[PDB]
Amino acid sequence: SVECPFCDEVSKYEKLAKIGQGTFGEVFKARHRKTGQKVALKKVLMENEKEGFPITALREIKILQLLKHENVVNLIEICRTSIYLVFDFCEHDLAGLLSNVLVKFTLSEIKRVMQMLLNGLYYIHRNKILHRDMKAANVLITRDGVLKLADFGLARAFSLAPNRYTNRVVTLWYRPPELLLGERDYGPPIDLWGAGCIMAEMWTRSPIMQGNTEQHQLALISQLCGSITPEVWPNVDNYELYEKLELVKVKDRLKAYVRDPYALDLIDKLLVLDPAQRIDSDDALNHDFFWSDPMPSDLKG
Amino acid sequence: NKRWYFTREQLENSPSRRFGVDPDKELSYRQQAANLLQDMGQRLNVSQLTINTAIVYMHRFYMIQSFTRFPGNSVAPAALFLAAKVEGQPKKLEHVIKVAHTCLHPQESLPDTRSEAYLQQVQDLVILESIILQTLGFELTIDHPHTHVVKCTQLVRASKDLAQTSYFMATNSLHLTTFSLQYTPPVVACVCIHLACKWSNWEIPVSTDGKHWWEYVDATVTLELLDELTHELLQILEKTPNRLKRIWNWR
Numbered sequence: 098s099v100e101c102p103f104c105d106e107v108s109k110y111e112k113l114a115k116i117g118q119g120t121f122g123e124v125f126k127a128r129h130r131k132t133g134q135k136v137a138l139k140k141v142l143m144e145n146e147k148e149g150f151p152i153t154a155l156r157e158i159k160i161l162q163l164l165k166h167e168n169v170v171n172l173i174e175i176c177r178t179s180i181y182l183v184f185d186f187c188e189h190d191l192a193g194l195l196s197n198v199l200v201k202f203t204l205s206e207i208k209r210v211m212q213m214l215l216n217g218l219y220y221i222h223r224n225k226i227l228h229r230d231m232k233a234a235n236v237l238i239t240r241d242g243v244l245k246l247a248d249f250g251l252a253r254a255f256s257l258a259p260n261r262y263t264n265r266v267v268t269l270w271y272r273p274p275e276l277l278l279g280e281r282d283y284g285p286p287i288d289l290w291g292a293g294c295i296m297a298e299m300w301t302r303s304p305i306m307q308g309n310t311e312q313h314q315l316a317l318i319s320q321l322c323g324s325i326t327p328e329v330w331p332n333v334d335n336y337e338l339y340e341k342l343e344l345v346k347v348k349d350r351l352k353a354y355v356r357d358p359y360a361l362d363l364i365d366k367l368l369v370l371d372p373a374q375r376i377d378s379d380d381a382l383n384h385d386f387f388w389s390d391p392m393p394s395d396l397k398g
Numbered sequence: 399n400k401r402w403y404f405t406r407e408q409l410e411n412s413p414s415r416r417f418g419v420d421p422d423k424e425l426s427y428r429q430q431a432a433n434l435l436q437d438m439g440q441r442l443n444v445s446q447l448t449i450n451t452a453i454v455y456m457h458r459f460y461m462i463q464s465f466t467r468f469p470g471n472s473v474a475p476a477a478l479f480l481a482a483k484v485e486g487q488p489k490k491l492e493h494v495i496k497v498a499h500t501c502l503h504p505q506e507s508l509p510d511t512r513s514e515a516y517l518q519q520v521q522d523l524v525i526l527e528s529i530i531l532q533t534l535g536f537e538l539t540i541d542h543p544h545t546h547v548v549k550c551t552q553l554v555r556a557s558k559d560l561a562q563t564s565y566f567m568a569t570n571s572l573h574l575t576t577f578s579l580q581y582t583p584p585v586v587a588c589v590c591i592h593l594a595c596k597w598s599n600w601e602i603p604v605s606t607d608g609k610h611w612w613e614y615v616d617a618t619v620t621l622e623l624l625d626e627l628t629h630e631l632l633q634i635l636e637k638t639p640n641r642l643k644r645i646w647n648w649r
């Protein structure tokens with residue numbers, strides 16, 4: 098019965114297909130009833146919500162409205178009837194492509210995928226934001242071959258005053274060593290660790306470190322990255338979780354799948370243990386991997 | 399982008415006007431809702447920023463909705479509840495309701511938290527927060543004149559006193575005027591410095607070029623406006639009992 102000039106009813110879009118199942122909610126492909134424009138409709142979840150509109154959804158919406166970039170997913174508007182987030186539709190997700198055995202990646206297409214992804218991280222970090230949920234399923238690609246960073250549900254703003262940020266972030270497999278060691282004072286480097294895992298994934302087709310618990314993950318990380326000692330990671334022992342489990346070489350394990358040497362080299366500077374020594378978005382975009390033949394090419398496979 | 403800025407003619411033709419409410423009554427209802435926000439805000443121990451955000455939500459809400467259908471005493475608590483979540487100081491729904499109650503019915507008694515009466519007035523606040531969100535089109539990120547005040551009080555090497563008077567003007571513009579609906583935060587901040595200066599008898603030194611202190615804050619601002627705005631702000635401050643007293647030099 099009430100006027101609502103700036104929140105249109107989602108009935109303006111016509112659902113076509115429920116494309117996303119999981120615990121993130123329900124994602125629908127839809128079609129603008131007048132123009133045919135395709136969109137993604139992501140309903141805001143209200144399971145056990147006893148504090149009104151979910152504070153986490155406000156955060157996510159706040160961040161999406163701020164992040165406006167060719168390689169970050171695009172919130173068009175927010176709709177009602179219950180509440181829907183409406184995005185420009187992206188037909189593919191990197192997880193689904195990586196699994197379809199009929200899909201093939203030329204190296205110059207891999208270069209372009211990693212380039213668009215790294216450019217997206219450069220952007221969100223410049224805007225003082227951490228993604229905190231890096232993984233294949235959150236990298237999307239449009240019909241026209243433009244990669245979009247998506248799902249900012251765990252995302253959070255950062256800055257630089259000792260930081261009091263939350264520890265249980267990032268799905269186990271893409272979670273970086275810091276977080277496993279119980280870190281609470283971190284920033285952008287955690288997302289680049291994920292980018293490293295995703296990059297390797299472009300050749301292996303499978304997430305490369307499939308841990309079962311936090312300690313079996315840390316273990317799997319050691320059997321690829323070396324042990325976690327103050328010789329490799331100064332002052333790592335300053336943390337009260339180096340206790341267990343202790344233990345005492347990345348290019349080797351990936352030789353078979355990844356042929357390009359520049360590619361292997363970049364993967365090794367992303368999957369570094371010490372965050373202070375981990376390569377950043379800027380220096381990664383400048384790595385010779387992106388500036389040697391074959392050059393990055395547009396996506397059509 | 400120009401969505402929440404209105405001409406003086408649009409401020410005149412408000413939704414509350416279409417339903418009878420006079421221009422001076424409407425200004426009053428906003429001042430009352432601001433007071434209610436400041437009162438609940440101080441008792442809930444949230445910051446002046448959270449409150450200012452609440453006040454701007456309220457202001458914009460009544461450029462779309464009318465005071466005759468949405469009473470400020472119902473809207474303000476819900477606006478504050480939302481602003482606290484947006485601004486990082488979440489307060490619990492029950493807590494905001496208890497505090498709204500004691501502010502509005504000082505003598506009444508906290509209803510039985512198990513009654514069908516109370517359960518309903520909780521649902522009413524959750525319904526209003528949803529109505530506020532939709533009315534604002536989910537645009538909850540607010541820029542305040544304060545942000546820009548520090549920027550141009552170092553630009554006049556003003557004492558700590560001149561600066562604190564400027565924030566006071568800033569906060570009071572939100573309560574007492576509708577500048578937040580007409581002028582960008584950077585402009586409102588100039589108006590606030592300009593008047594804090596007039597009030598403190600602090601005179602600003604001419605820049606090295608010949609240009610004035612405000613030019614380095616918003617290109618649109620002209621002295622002709624600054625004087626019209628500081629005069630309007632000053633008049634309302636004079637009508638507000640005990641306010642000027644707070645920044646008045648008693649020595």
Ligand SMILES: CN1CC[C@H](c2c(O)cc(O)c3c(=O)cc(-c4ccccc4Cl)oc23)[C@H](O)C1
Binds near residue numbers: 235
């Ligand atoms: C975990 N997750 C990944 C991101 C996803 C998501 C977004 O957050 C935002 C979007 O615009 C999309 C989109 O357009 C298409 C798809 C999509 C595409 C293909 C297969 C499966 C999916 Cl879920 O997902 C989108 C959703 O948050 C759930």
